[PDB]
Each structure stands twice: as structure tokens, then as C-alpha cells.
Design a protein around this ligand. Sequence first.
Ligand SMILES: NC(=O)c1ccc[n+]([C@@H]2O[C@H](COP(=O)([O-])OP(=O)(O)OC[C@H]3O[C@@H](n4cnc5c(N)ncnc54)[C@H](OP(=O)(O)O)[C@@H]3O)[C@@H](O)[C@H]2O)c1
Ligand SMILES: CC(=O)c1cccc(-c2cc3nc(N)nc(N)c3cc2C)c1
Length: 157
Amino acid sequence: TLSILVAHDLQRVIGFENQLPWHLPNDLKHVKKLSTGHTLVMGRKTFESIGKPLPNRRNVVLTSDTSFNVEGVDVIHSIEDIYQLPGHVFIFGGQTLFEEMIDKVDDMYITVIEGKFRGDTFFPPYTFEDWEVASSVEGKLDEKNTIPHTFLHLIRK
Ligand SMILES: NC(=O)c1ccc[n+]([C@@H]2O[C@H](COP(=O)([O-])OP(=O)(O)OC[C@H]3O[C@@H](n4cnc5c(N)ncnc54)[C@H](OP(=O)(O)O)[C@@H]3O)[C@@H](O)[C@H]2O)c1
Ligand SMILES: CC(=O)c1cccc(-c2cc3nc(N)nc(N)c3cc2C)c1
């Protein structure tokens, strides 16, 4: 299975100045639950933003930099390499990876952040004409999670 994993706001903002624009611990728990024991593929900027691989999954970084050889990370240099990765592979960002992969993936796990943030990077437009809502789950709000959000699993029709 090849899936997208993304959090985007009401206007599809995903990032600002190489960080996520919001603080939402519940989304990180969601990412942990979905991708633990599987594979994340991410662009170089996304990797540099987190600074080290996420524990307990295969971390794969797509970059043209042939000097990239980082402990605990596998490197790939072509989109085509993604198709050779075994098991459940999640396309993890950022904007450039999402744009390159949205027409190729089987499904998408989207956290819709129900607010409008300042962004400099975006998820590409998509239409529910093309995507079946396999599930839609409102996230719970509390002291540590104060922005409304919804977890959508979309499957290509
Ligand atoms: N909200 C979310 O779900 C989410 C998730 C992830 C990231 N983000 C945000 O997304 C933003 C970063 O997105 P971005 O588009 O600027 O960067 P990115 O997608 O993370 O990384 C872009 C880099 O990936 C490499 N790359 C992409 N396609 C390639 C290809 N076909 N061949 C070789 N290398 C390729 C290139 O690295 P080289 O230049 O080294 O060749 C390119 O400069 C940040 O703000 C981050 O916080 C948001
Ligand atoms: C430290 C850590 O796990 C962390 C910190 C800030 C942001 C993110 C982060 C959260 C994310 N959430 C979702 N739904 N999807 C992604 N593709 C994603 C990607 C990254 C990089 C992760």
C-alpha cells in the first residue's frame, strides 16, 4: 500500500518556515499510531525540519544530494525508487513530495486542521469526486489540543 499522510488546514496550508504552523499533540499520536512499524518517505527539507529519524519505522529521505548518508535513515534519489520499498509506505511530505505523489497513491490519511494559518507551503487541491471517505473522525479537544481537527481516511475511487 502506498498512502499519503498529511495534516492540512482549511486552505490546505501544511507548513510555514520549515515547520508545521500549529501545535497539536493528538496529530503526532495519530502519525505514531499509523506509521509505527511501517515506512515514511519524506523530502530533504522535511527531514531537516525534524532533524533525526522518527523512532520505530523505516525513515527514507528523497534528495538529489549524493553526499547524504545519515545514521538511521535510508536515502533515495528518485521518485521511482519509492515503488521498490516493501510493506506499507507513507508519503510523509513536504509540499514537493505531496505534489509528486498525490496522483500515484492508493489512499490518504489527512488530518484536517479546522483553522486558517499563515503558510508558505500547501497540499495540492483535490476533490471528493475522486476520493471516497472511508472514515471521518472528529479529534478530541482539551488542554493540550485546542484546535479542532478531523481525521479523514480517503480512498481513491
Ligand atoms: N503538515 C504536514 O503534514 C507536513 C508534512 C511534511 C512537511 N510539511 C512542511 O512542508 C514544508 C516542506 O516542504 P517542501 O516542499 O519545501 O520540501 P520537502 O518536500 O520536504 O523537500 C523538498 C526536497 O526534497 C527533495 N526532492 C523532492 N523530490 C525529489 C525528486 N524527485 N528527486 C530528488 N529529490 C527530490 C529535494 O531535496 P534536495 O534539494 O536536497 O535535492 C527537494 O529540495 C515544511 O514547511 C514542512 O514543515 C508539512
Ligand atoms: C517531532 C515530530 O514527530 C514532528 C514534529 C513536527 C511535525 C511533525 C509532522 C506531523 C505530521 N502530521 C501528519 N498528519 N502528517 C505528516 N505527514 C506529518 C509530518 C510531520 C513531519 C512531526
